[PDB]
Amino acid sequence: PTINQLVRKGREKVRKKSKVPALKGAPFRRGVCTVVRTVTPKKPNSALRKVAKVRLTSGYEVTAYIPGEGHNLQEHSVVLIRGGRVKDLPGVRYHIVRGVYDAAGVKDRKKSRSKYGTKKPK
């Protein structure tokens, strides 16, 4: 395009779509679980990924991931969620943060305790 074209029409500044709109700004949010279940993922995986449908404090309702082995969550669990999606679990766009509210950390977890809300042993 010519210099004139650019004077006439400028260049177009391009915007980013947030991938966590349910978050409505916030770094995290508090939720309550409406559903709690297992879901089988897409090819070429095969599992029973454990997730949770969650009623955010924004009125929004999203489904979240529950990370680790075993969990104590269920209908009516008060819960906290950070963003970040799971590749194979489409629709699931958020993660449940362990060791907060009625989300347990993981018993018997020594490595990466931080990412799993587990206190240090003695």
Partner: peptide, 10 residues
Amino acid sequence: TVXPVXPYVX
């Protein structure tokens, strides 16, 4: 937002 019997309302 509310539910079955929960005093939590979301």
